[model samples]
Target chain A: GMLYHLVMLEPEGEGAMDRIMEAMAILDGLAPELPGLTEFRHGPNRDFEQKSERYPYGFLCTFTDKAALDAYAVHPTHQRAGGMLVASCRNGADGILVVDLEV
Target chain B: GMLYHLVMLEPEGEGAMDRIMEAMAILDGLAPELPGLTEFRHGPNRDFEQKSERYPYGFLCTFTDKAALDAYAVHPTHQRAGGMLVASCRNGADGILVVDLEV
Candidate 1:
């Protein structure tokens, strides 16, 4: 089984790339240390047809089990990385949309 | 460039998997015929970590370009396949979530 978190994020300004870059760096370092996380990937939306204001970037990763996902969620490092994303996101508290699925 | 659509869907009843399976076959058949569509893939979630009522399944695939993606959207075959998913998915008009990002 595969577990993935699909995140939709819209950064506040033109400097969105910079913030995403930071998030990418943080994720690269932190995910491997998290209890549940098994993989991580970050990138921009290349499709113009479906591109929208609310979703300019993609944050997707994998986890092993529910326990691992929970462990990563409350981890201090995860929180810190989330802060970087929130800082640059446009929707303030709602700037990020995280939903998970199993495949 | 990669264009992907992340869809969150919940089936109407216990037959959710069946509809998804049908859609998968339809997609596999139709995606190849569509003008711009490319690289079709469909699967379910593996991780129990973040599963939720609203998003029980995942529909994700890649496209080569925005134009190709757009072409597929309006294709009759795609419309037919999408209708099948909507019929079985929960949330009625809101059952499915389609969002795109470039990578």
Candidate 2:
């Protein structure tokens, strides 16, 4: 089974969007070096149901397994990306929502 | 691009887990009938980053496009599943967090 990692962000600062994009770019760039990274993508939330307007942007990625997910969690590059994302959110880290589902 | 639909749930009450599983089963059962439903999955959140403790369960699925997602939204089966899920949550619909990404 794969581990599906999801992140929802409410960007608020003047440069929040840029930071979010940059953070996503940083994480996406890690695909080449990260061993278990099968996929990575980030973009504005579509809010098709019209119930998720608060979180305007988000990202989704998949890892091979739990170990792979753990590896990515502590990766130095991921730290940088996470830091950038936190700085861009409305309440810093509080503005971010993360969930990982094993499927 | 594929449309990734993610939902995080903060299950509450006595029958919350059961209802959540039932809801997921209902959604999963619709896979064969719904066109453009590429993938569907639901499970407990791994909390890989330890930042999503509040929302303990989640689901992720993909569609061929926005239209496909829209179709799934109004599907009779989905309505039933969504209702069960909302009822299981802490604050009804408020306890659920949804985000969709065009990847």
Candidate 3:
């Protein structure tokens, strides 16, 4: 069985646009480097009517196994790339909402 | 009236994750700056069982008017930040699916 997780981040800053682009670049680069990662997809929000009051960016990564994903959390690439994300967020802040499931 | 667009990216190569994250961040920071952007929300898809067969990640953004969103599409910040995204994709790889509704 595999454990699935979703990580969301909201960034804040002057050069925020640059930071956001960098973060996405990191995710794009890291997807194939990690083990157990089977499926991945991400993009900007298009729903502007009802639900746009909250959340801004989204990323989805699937692993073949739970352990592989767990390892990905601490993976050096993820940490380094994700670190840029952490920095660009507001109040040294970023919002992360996770949803876990068994596969 | 606002034109809603859902930009979906199916990245290829080792840097897919990085690209995805960067795109999201760009949207995040640019959300408020846009003239008529009224609502914005984006996050990884929690549904891993059924939808995983198709799309992997999703984002939703709402604008108060179509002109504002059209302007955003060509905005320099969006273009610059979005330029990296265009580069990282595969085979002109990127999907923009739009659903427009009246307010």
Candidate 4:
């Protein structure tokens, strides 16, 4: 299996929440179309103790194998969603980080 | 703020759960010593529909700022925990994925 981990930073602004929600919705809508995607989970950070200082949201997805994951990475939907996310945080995020694992 | 996202894979075997649990415990125990760490949340995937086919666990942690996060990245506790994780999965995990974000 292949695991894809993503962490995104949203800019500090009046519309941050709305913009993040929009990007998340896009990703959620595109999930089912990705081939070899066996499982997925996405959610906003909910730890009350850390709520004042944490990433607002994040996601995890599993693929049947590395090749499937690679395909998903370049898929149009993913690219589009990623673009949206990047644009949304263009002014705020220090940077974005990504990691992939194979099992 | 900074967000560090991680995805870890363990070998499929009888001891997989125990090993993963141990790594998680180690990470949890070491969290407090890491510099700049403002909040952290780690958990097993709870989406039942995809439970049979997904990464067993995922984690997200936040830092107060970029400098603090950088210090934590190489902190002894984190390095030790990471080394333990790598050793525990020496035979099984295909790979590990990581993502970092600044907000």
Best by lDDT: 2
* lDDT of each candidate versus the true structure: 0.70, 0.86, 0.58, 0.56
Q: What does candidate 3's lDDT look like per residue over B1-103, in tens digits?
A: 4444444344556886587788778878988888687756555554432423224455555566768777777788778756765665555433322333332
Clashing pairs in 2: none
In candidate 3 the C-alpha lDDT for residue B23 amounts to 75
Q: What is the C-alpha lDDT profile of model 2 across B1-103, one tens digit per residue? A: 7788888898989989998998888988997788799888888887867988998888887889988888998899998999999899988998887788887
> TM-score of A-chain in each prediction?
0.84, 0.94, 0.79, 0.72
> Per-candidate DockQ versus the true complex?
0.33, 0.73, 0.05, 0.05
Kindly report which residue stretches of model 2 are placed more than 4 angstroms away from their true locations once superposed: none
Higher-scoring candidate on lDDT, 1 or 3: 1
The reply for model 4, stretches above 4 Å from the true place, is A48-54, A90-93, B1-103
lDDT tens readout by residue for model 2, A20-71: 8888788878977888988888778878767789889888878899888888
Name the regions of candidate 1 deviating beyond 4 angstroms: A13-16, A34-36, B10-21, B25-57, B62-79, B86-96
Q: Which sections of candidate 3 miss by over 4 Å?
A: B1-103
lDDT of 4 by residue, B12-81 (tens): 5556567666767877876688757765556554323232234455566666666766676677777776
Accuracy of chain B in candidate 1 (TM-score): 0.82
TM-score of predicted structure 1: 0.66
Candidates ranked, most accurate by lDDT first: 2, 1, 3, 4
Candidate 4: give the clashing pairs.
A94-B102, A97-B99, A97-B100, A98-B99, A99-B97, A99-B98, A100-B97, A102-B94, A102-B95, A103-B94
Error of 1 at A40 (Å): 1.3
